[PDB]
């Protein structure tokens, strides 16, 4: 979606921040351990209700404020009609409130959900993105992005696996199906049992085998992700880079001017642009078009001189018009982005 506004108070890592997302690419930075990582957590908790750091909702209250509630509002366009959501949560009171009021053209908010459980259902119903997927989509951790790029084919099919579906759910379906077969094998009626066993066991085998469904599913990403990755590498690179995928080779084989080339050979800013592009392509082929992205700096030890160069080459992302915000930790990356946002000591300076 397009995050327009996000007023956070006493949310973990934050005390009182007021952010207004604007067209282009913003970059938030502050003293390590506060504001930067925590700010996004807040946005992902305003939608459904479950962040990504803690399981229990109440744990998301700032340590600096005890017995105090944490309020956070959030406006966001999605489908041509902007919505607004404000949840509050107090550890002491043991009570959590919320409300998904949509903002009308008239300027008056309309009710859609009262309980936090209702706001979750409604939000997930908007653009068919469950919290599980949302966490693995709009938030792109630089470390995992760059890794996906120069990843092997086996580790790649894995990445694609645990982004469209929970590994746990698959294992549970596994065990349940195996249990049903054990039940059948142990036990007119006998013919119906043999029909059920064979049919349930066959489906099992179809879903279970990596060679078939698992193989096809991976294709969608290569046939869909690449399809879209190419377009990104064109609008950002002026038709210079064009990548594809191949098992025979390492995996994501990348071509520069029709000529393939090792991804390690590329400069940092190229690894970044190309990697981020593929990443948004995967994120979007899984969750539809996205109008925003959160990327945090990875600060690989040998990546410092590049930090200033990478900043210049990534600036091309602004051409996509998406709301792209960087969650950098180092000042050198933070500097070369006209639009800056520093968060010191929980507050914004």
């Amino acid at each position: 979606m397009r995050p327009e506004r996000l007023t956070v108070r006493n949310f973990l890592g934050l005390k009182n921040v007021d952010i207004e997302f604007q067209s282009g690419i913003t970059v938030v930075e502050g003293p390590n351990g506060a504001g930067k990582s925590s700010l996004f957590e807040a946005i992902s908790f305003a939608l459904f209700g479950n962040g990504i750091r803690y399981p229990n909702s109440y744990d998301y209250v700032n340590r600096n404020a005890v017995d105090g509630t944490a309020r956070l509002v959030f406006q966001f366009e999605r489908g041509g009609k902007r919505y607004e959501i404000i949840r509050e949560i107090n550890a002491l009171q043991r009570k959590h409130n919320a409300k998904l009021s949509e903002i009308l053209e008239n300027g008056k908010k309309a009710a859609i959900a009262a309980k936090p459980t209702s706001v979750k259902q409604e939000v997930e119903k908007i653009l068919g993105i469950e919290h599980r997927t949302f966490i693995r989509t709009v938030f792109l951790p630089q470390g995992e992005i760059d890794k996906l790029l120069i990843s092997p084919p086996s580790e790649i099919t894995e990445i694609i696996s645990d982004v469209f579906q929970s590994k746990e759910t698959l294992e549970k379906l596994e065990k349940l199906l195996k249990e049903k077969m054990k039940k059948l094998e142990n036990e007119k009626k006998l013919k119906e049992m043999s029909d059920e066993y064979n049919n349930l066991d066959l489906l099992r085998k179809y879903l279970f085998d990596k060679s078939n469904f698992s193989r096809y599913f991976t294709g969608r990403v290569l046939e869909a992700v690449l399809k879209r990755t190419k377009a990104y590498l064109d609008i950002l690179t002026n038709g210079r880079f064009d990548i594809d995928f191949d098992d025979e080779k390492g995996g994501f084989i990348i071509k520069d001017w029709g000529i393939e080339r090792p991804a390690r050979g590329l400069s940092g800013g190229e690894r970044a642009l190309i990697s981020i592009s593929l990443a948004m392509s995967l994120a979007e082929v899984a969750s539809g078009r996205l109008d925003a992205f959160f990327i945090d700096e990875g600060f690989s030890s040998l990546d410092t001189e590049n930090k200033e160069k990478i900043a210049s080459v990534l600036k091309e992302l602004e051409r996509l018009n998406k709301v792209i915000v960087f969650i950098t930790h180092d000042r050198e990356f933070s500097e070369a982005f006209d639009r800056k946002l520093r968060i010191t000591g929980g507050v914004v300076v």
Binding site: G128, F164, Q165, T169, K172, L173, L176, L177, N199, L200, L202, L203, Y206, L207, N212, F213, Y216, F217, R220, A224, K227, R228, A231, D234, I235, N238, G239, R240, D256, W257, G258, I259, R261, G265, L266, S267, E270, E284, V285, A286, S287, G288, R289, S312, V313, E316
Partner: protein, 362 residues
């Protein structure tokens, strides 16, 4: 009758003299060769020449003249040729051409707004309606041009078999001419003076054949070659395009020339048969002597971010548009249904397993 038409040639044209001079003559001959060879193999009846046949209109090199007359002969060997030289071209080429016209039937230089009646290889009676650059104040000039068209029209109606219009101008100093102004009764309108091929209209069939070699990068995306038109009495005009096969061009665009950029340029130029031009925006050195190293790197420029985006054009297909997002199981639901005679049943037991796991989770 069959007609092979070739646009401007630009013989003895040296490309990129400001950066790295390249003698296109070799390439230009090879393309002409392929074109002429196609004209013979196709046994055309008439050959048309228009536009800038010589590159330099004030001082053609001796060799350039040698080549022109050379190919004029090769041309005549196959079929009668009619040349319409534009006024831009040098004058001794008009007096010369006129002299040869008079001593021969296999060649005819038209150099006046007055019509001439040539005769094709197979004997077809073709009437040429000429409209060259008026040689030797703007409102009277347009009036003058419009009058000549009225003249060509009247003279076109008095044709025998076919009537081909020939013109040296720019379809709407240059001469602007409205498409409506061109005679409609002509069987074909051969134009020239434009490097890039352009089929103006289909009635009457108006064509710019364009050059046979990419003279500059402003036309790296062009197909180069002649046009083989075919006029018949009973049926409407039909025309193919003959591909020249001339060396290709490629512009490499960079944000800034750095260690990676350099490797990219080197790698590309090394495997590229044509000529290369690198363009960049951000200041980048301090650049090494690529031309000195890369012998086929003809030009290195610096387009502004505004201009590099304008010239690039738009390629928005399959972008910024909605993408069919598909979830893992609904794709499973789909893969199974397509790949088995009876799906509905497996589909049903799946959703039941899903329901069972959902419930046993909350």
């Amino acid at each position: 009758m069959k007609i092979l038409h070739t646009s401007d040639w630009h013989l003895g044209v040296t490309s990129w003299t400001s950066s790295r001079p390249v003698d296109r003559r070799e390439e230009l001959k090879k393309a002409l060769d392929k074109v002429v060879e196609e004209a013979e193999k196709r046994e055309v009846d008439l050959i048309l020449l228009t536009g800038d046949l010589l590159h330099s209109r004030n001082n053609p090199s001796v060799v350039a003249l040698h080549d022109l007359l050379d190919y004029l002969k090769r041309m005549m060997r196959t079929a009668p040729v009619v040349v319409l030289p534009g006024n831009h071209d040098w004058k001794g080429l008009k007096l010369f051409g006129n002299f040869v016209t008079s001593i021969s039937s296999d060649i005819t230089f038209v150099m006046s707004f007055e019509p001439v009646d040539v005769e094709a290889k197979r004997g077809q009676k073709v009437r040429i309606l000429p409209f060259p650059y008026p040689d030797e104040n703007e409102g009277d000039f347009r009036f003058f041009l419009e009058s000549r068209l009225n003249k060509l029209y009247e003279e076109a109606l008095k044709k025998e078999d076919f009537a081909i219009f020939m013109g040296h101008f720019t379809v709407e100093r240059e001469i602007i001419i409205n498409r409506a102004l061109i005679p409609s009764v002509v069987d074909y309108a051969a134009l020239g003076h434009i490097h890039s091929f352009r089929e103006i209209q289909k009635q009457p069939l108006t064509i710019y054949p364009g050059s046979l070699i990419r003279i500059d990068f402003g036309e790296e995306a062009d197909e180069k070659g002649a046009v083989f038109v075919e006029l018949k009495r009973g049926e409407p005009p039909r025309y193919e395009r003959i591909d020249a096969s001339p060396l290709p061009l490629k512009t490499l665009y960079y944000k800034k020339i750095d260690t990676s950029a350099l490797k990219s340029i080197r790698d590309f130029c090394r495997n590229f048969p044509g000529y290369v031009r690198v363009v960049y925006e951000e200041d980048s050195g301090i650049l090494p002597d690529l031309m000195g190293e890369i012998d086929n790197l003809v030009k290195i420029e610096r387009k502004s971010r505004r201009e590099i985006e304008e010239v690039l054009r738009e390629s928005p297909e399959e972008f910024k548009e909605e993408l069919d997002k598909l979830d893992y199981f609904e794709l499973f639901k789909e893969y199974l249904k397509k790949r088995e005679e009876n799906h509905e049943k497996l589909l049903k037991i799946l959703d039941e397993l899903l329901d069972e796991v959902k419930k046993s989770e909350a």
